[PDB]
Amino acid sequence: QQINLGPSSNPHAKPSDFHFLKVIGKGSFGKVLLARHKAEEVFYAVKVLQKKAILVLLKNVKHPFLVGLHFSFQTADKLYFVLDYINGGELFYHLQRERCFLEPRARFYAAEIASALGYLHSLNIVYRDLKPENILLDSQGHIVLTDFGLCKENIEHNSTTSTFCGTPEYLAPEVLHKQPYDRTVDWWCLGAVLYEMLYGLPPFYSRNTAEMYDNILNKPLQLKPNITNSARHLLEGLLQKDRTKRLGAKDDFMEIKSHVFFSLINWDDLINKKITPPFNPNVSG
Numbered sequence: 001q002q003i004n005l006g007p008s009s010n011p012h013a014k015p016s017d018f019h020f021l022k023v024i025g026k027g028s029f030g031k032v033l034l035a036r037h038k039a040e041e042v043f044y045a046v047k048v049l050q051k052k053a054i055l056v057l058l059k060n061v062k063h064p065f066l067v068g069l070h071f072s073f074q075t076a077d078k079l080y081f082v083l084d085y086i087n088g089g090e091l092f093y094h095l096q097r098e099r100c101f102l103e104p105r106a107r108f109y110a111a112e113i114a115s116a117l118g119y120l121h122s123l124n125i126v127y128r129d130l131k132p133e134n135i136l137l138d139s140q141g142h143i144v145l146t147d148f149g150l151c152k153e154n155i156e157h158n159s160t161t162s163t164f165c166g167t168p169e170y171l172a173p174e175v176l177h178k179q180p181y182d183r184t185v186d187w188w189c190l191g192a193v194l195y196e197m198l199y200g201l202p203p204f205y206s207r208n209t210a211e212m213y214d215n216i217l218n219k220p221l222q223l224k225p226n227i228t229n230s231a232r233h234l235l236e237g238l239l240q241k242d243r244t245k246r247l248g249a250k251d252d253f254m255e256i257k258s259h260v261f262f263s264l265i266n267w268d269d270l271i272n273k274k275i276t277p278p279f280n281p282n283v284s285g
């Protein structure tokens, strides 16, 4: 009954190695807990998924902007995954406190997310459902995305939706049409994150969920005149409804990488964290 977890697997690790403090959060499946390793005396985030949710399950990818996986293990009923505890706060918590970001700062976060997505696509992996709840900052103020390689397609999601005030997600037109997830959905999500970073609300927003779905599919893009033309151009490109016309359809990350909005970004410097972040979270750990 032992599930194959991959190279990260730990035959020696048991739950009794961990002090479990509180519930950190919940994605689309399972739960995440704050845990202090009894012996090691350090803090981790342990995702715990129940075996009665699986209908190669884990394919971890290392990258400077993807949350690090330390090891994984299992019991009779549950699977456990030990991750870095990221204490710089959720990106959108900082956005909340500020209403919106200036473009240079928004650009920096968008660039880090873009590089991780572009890296993932090169290894033939698609993010699928990038959401604000997935976007954290580390102690230094660099972006950390919470996906660590779990196969979403093989795990049963818990996803009903409310008519008013749903879970914050960026559903692309093609996702609503329930068409295969490909690399161009990730670019729609990038554009939506960038849109929200600039305007303080997701694009096509409505209090009513159905209205929002309606707006995503049928309402033309609304770009108020408070951003530079390069920002406008990028958002017009990334938030195309037709994914065959969308920025990234023909050359993927190279189209975003070479876009005028990111002209001031040295992509080698960024990926290697040589650019001092535009904001320092008021903590260290």
Ligand SMILES: O=C(O)c1ccc(-c2c[nH]c3ncc(-c4ccccc4)cc23)cc1
Binding pocket: 024, 025, 026, 027, 028, 032, 045, 047, 067, 083, 084, 085, 086, 087, 090, 146, 147
């Ligand atoms: O798949 C998922 O739902 C998932 C997988 C990993 C995480 C996660 C890994 N490390 C973390 N560190 C901190 C926090 C955190 C701390 C305070 C407030 C909110 C989040 C979350 C994580 C989260 C979700």
